[PDB]
Design a protein around this ligand. Structure first.
Ligand SMILES: C[C@H](NC(=O)Nc1cc2[nH]ncc2c(CO)n1)c1ccccc1
Lengths: 362, 17, 11
């Protein structure tokens, strides 16, 4: 019948900023948190466990790319398990695929995020250091499963009252099995502009995991000055912003560009001189600035890998390889085969959420 | 305003050294 | 590469 109507018998559908949340009798007392193009996250009260949770309503079935991203986030998160990464505790959707217009994702509730924190507070070095370590600890696990986040930014860094950090919004994430070649196969417009690596623009569809390391450095820079490091208006201005600090690329740097048209654009650019970090960031710990420089390296292949970053001096107090785990089974090439129509993707989403359905009985 | 000594991960690191 | 054309489009 109608679960909402059955819920309505006690307490049922609730309205939040023009969006109805049919999260059933179990979840009530929803409060708006944030929203995206096709989704909205709310805090809510789990009446069964008598605790508050976060609920993400997803409405992707109209568009094929939304469906692709929804299935990727659900499949990656359901198999991921890590301290510094958000997980899926429950999934809510209609019993029949015909009625499935929205999909509800229930996650651990986090009080705030790094983006919110930096607007109101300046972080002490020990806070920056600990936050940065946690970011990389989750990132090590992510890259260990052959997964690229592709949207690391302050807003995607959840924070609770006990200085615990988790990474969320894996909708832009994707599998890239290392054995296969992905040059020219990867989605072109990825990451947020200010945290977008140079090679994403310069080598469209030919980037690697190193784009995440670049984002971390931007976040680290943002923590250090409570201000974005590369506030580009558009991709041209963004490229100018990147080269404003790093300076004109080296010839070795120029040789890693495989887009010849792009390389010639760089050659056509006026010479700009590299800016030292200490002048830009006077009060920053040099140990941090040594690592900051190393994750902002123009060359992606020579960019500091996630394991190497953890072992950098600046995190030596928190560095412990025996408690920086990896996934038991990384993701293979078969998991990236989602170049499908949305009607098929909708079926795949429906199958993947079947375990959460009431009385599944495996 | 509720900005270490309460985080499980930080505690585990300190215990070792 | 629809959005990253390095031959500059006319302003
Ligand atoms: C970034 C986010 N994706 C996600 O999983 N968010 C999440 C989980 C949370 N738990 N506790 C809090 C919390 C938050 C708070 O922002 N957000 C999103 C949201 C809307 C549209 C697209 C994408």
């Amino acid at each position: 019948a109608s679960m909402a109507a059955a819920a309505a018998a006690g307490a049922g559908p609730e309205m939040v900023r023009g969006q109805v949340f049919d999260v059933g009798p179990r979840y009530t007392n929803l409060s708006y948190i944030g929203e995206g193009a096709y989704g909205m996250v709310c805090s809510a009260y789990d009446n069964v466990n008598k605790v508050r949770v976060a609920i993400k309503k997803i409405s992707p079935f109209e568009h094929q790319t939304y469906c692709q991203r929804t299935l990727r986030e659900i499949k990656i998160l359901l198999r991921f398990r890590h301290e510094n990464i958000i997980g899926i505790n429950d999934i809510i959707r209609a019993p029949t695929i015909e009625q499935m217009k929205d999909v509800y994702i229930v996650q651990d509730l986090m009080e705030t995020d790094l983006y919110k924190l930096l607007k109101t507070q300046h972080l002490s070095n020990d806070h920056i250091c600990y936050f940065l370590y946690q970011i990389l600890r989750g990132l090590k696990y992510i890259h260990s499963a052959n997964v690229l986040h592709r949207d690391l930014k302050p807003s995607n860094l959840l924070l609770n009252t006990t200085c615990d950090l988790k990474i969320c919004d894996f909708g832009l994430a994707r599998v890239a099995d290392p054995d296969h070649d992905h040059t020219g196969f990867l989605t072109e417009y990825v990451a947020t502009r200010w945290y977008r690596a140079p090679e994403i623009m310069l080598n469209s569809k030919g980037y690697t995991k190193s784009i995440d390391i670049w984002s971390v450095g931007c976040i680290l820079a943002e923590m250090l000055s409570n201000r974005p490091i590369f506030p580009g208006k558009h991709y041209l201005d963004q490229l100018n912003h990147i080269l404003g600090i790093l300076g004109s690329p080296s010839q070795e740097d120029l040789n890693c560009i495989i887009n010849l048209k792009a390389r010639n654009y760089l050659l056509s650019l006026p010479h700009k001189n590299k800016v030292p970090w200490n002048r830009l960031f006077p009060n920053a710990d040099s140990k941090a600035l040594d690592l900051l420089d190393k994750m902002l390296t123009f060359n992606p292949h020579k960019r500091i890998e996630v394991e190497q970053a953890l072992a950098h001096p600046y995190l030596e107090q928190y560095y412990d390889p025996s408690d920086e785990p990896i996934a038991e089974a990384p993701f293979k090439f078969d998991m990236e085969l989602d170049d499908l129509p949305k009607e098929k993707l909708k079926e795949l989403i429906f199958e993947e959420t079947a375990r959460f359905q009431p009385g599944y009985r495996s | 305003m509720q900005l270490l000594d309460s985080s499980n991960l930080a505690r585990r690191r300190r215990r070792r050294r | 590469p629809v959005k990253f054309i390095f031959p500059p489009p006319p302003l």
